[PDB]
Design a protein around this ligand. Structure first.
Ligand SMILES: C[N+](C)(C)CCO
Ligand SMILES: C[N+](C)(C)CCO
Ligand SMILES: C[N+](C)(C)CCO
Ligand SMILES: C[N+](C)(C)CCO
Ligand SMILES: C[N+](C)(C)CCO
Ligand SMILES: C[N+](C)(C)CCO
Ligand SMILES: C[N+](C)(C)CCO
Ligand SMILES: C[N+](C)(C)CCO
Ligand SMILES: C[N+](C)(C)CCO
Ligand SMILES: C[N+](C)(C)CCO
Lengths: 146, 146
């Protein structure tokens, strides 16, 4: 906790073990919290990382691995309990949400094709699933949903 | 997960067990996360709670018990790992912070009297402890610190 723990040489943070010594290019758990250190010892803060397990990870300005829902650059993302960004459907409370399969951001006000390519799910403006959507159709074929 | 879990009757969220039944006026852990439900079964969201253990707890709009640093109404608070709002000194990374003993918000740009009433600690504008503060004094007795 003096020459042994969180260190700061201007550019960023690194961390010192009694002796392992300082993590680089890996994850580390520190007082209960996961961080990632770049190839040069420096903690990632406010940054996306695409890991070796094919997952996307986010680290806040503080360096803490994101877990659960997190608004980032004005878009929602859900991260599983082990910090992996999720895509597709997720259960949150009483309802369902859908996260782009490409960028991973929550989708809203959209039709999502069903897995078997046969049908659709509508997600409202706030992103929730419509359990009971309502349609109206005008003569030109214009559709409103609610 | 249908007539058995997160429920929503307009006013707020309540939660149904196979059969305990629905928590009221207590904490509950649900899929790894702690919530609090008022005397009437409803999940607290975006709210301070003063618990029966004499601690202050915060619950975000989502209802999640706050843990770690959390900015709330434009002030910082550190919550211990079990969600109890902390006061006094805390260790964060390479430095120290001080949280008001009264309201619990982080203190910045201030002198804090040492425990034994004998000396002082200065915390900068961003709230960090000054390990090496510098003073200058003008003829009227005016002091700058840095
Ligand atoms: C150990 N440092 C983080 C200071 C530099 C690594 O090259
Ligand atoms: C200054 N804090 C410790 C409050 C957090 C900065 O990310
Ligand atoms: C979409 N979220 C569930 C992340 C929050 C909405 O309040
Ligand atoms: C399990 N994590 C992905 C959280 C880090 C170690 O691999
Ligand atoms: C509940 N949904 C069917 C919308 C998602 C599962 O694929
Ligand atoms: C998936 N991200 C949005 C995190 C980066 C682009 O691949
Ligand atoms: C939360 N409930 C609606 C189940 C109880 C109200 O008295
Ligand atoms: C232990 N907690 C305070 C986190 C909840 C139950 O009291
Ligand atoms: C080390 N400080 C004196 C800053 C406070 C610890 O109780
Ligand atoms: C007493 N607190 C400042 C902790 C909460 C605001 O009412």
């Amino acid at each position: 906790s003096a020459a042994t723990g969180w260190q700061k040489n201007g550019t960023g943070y690194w961390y010192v073990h009694s002796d392992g010594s300082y993590p680089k290019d890996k994850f580390e758990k520190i007082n209960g919290t996961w961080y990632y250190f770049d190839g040069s010892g420096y903690m990632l803060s406010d940054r996306w990382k695409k890991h070796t397990d094919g997952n996307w990870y986010y680290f806040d300005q503080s360096g803490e691995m994101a877990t659960g829902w997190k608004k980032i650059a004005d878009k929602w993302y859900y991260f599983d309990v082990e910090g992996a960004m999720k895509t597709g459907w997720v259960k949150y409370k009483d309802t369902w949400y859908y996260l782009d399969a490409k960028e991973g951001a929550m989708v809203s006000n959209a039709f999502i094709q069903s897995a078997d390519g046969t049908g659709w799910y509508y997600l409202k403006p706030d992103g929730t699933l419509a359990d009971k959507p309502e349609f109206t159709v005008e003569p030109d074929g214009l559709i409103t949903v609610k």
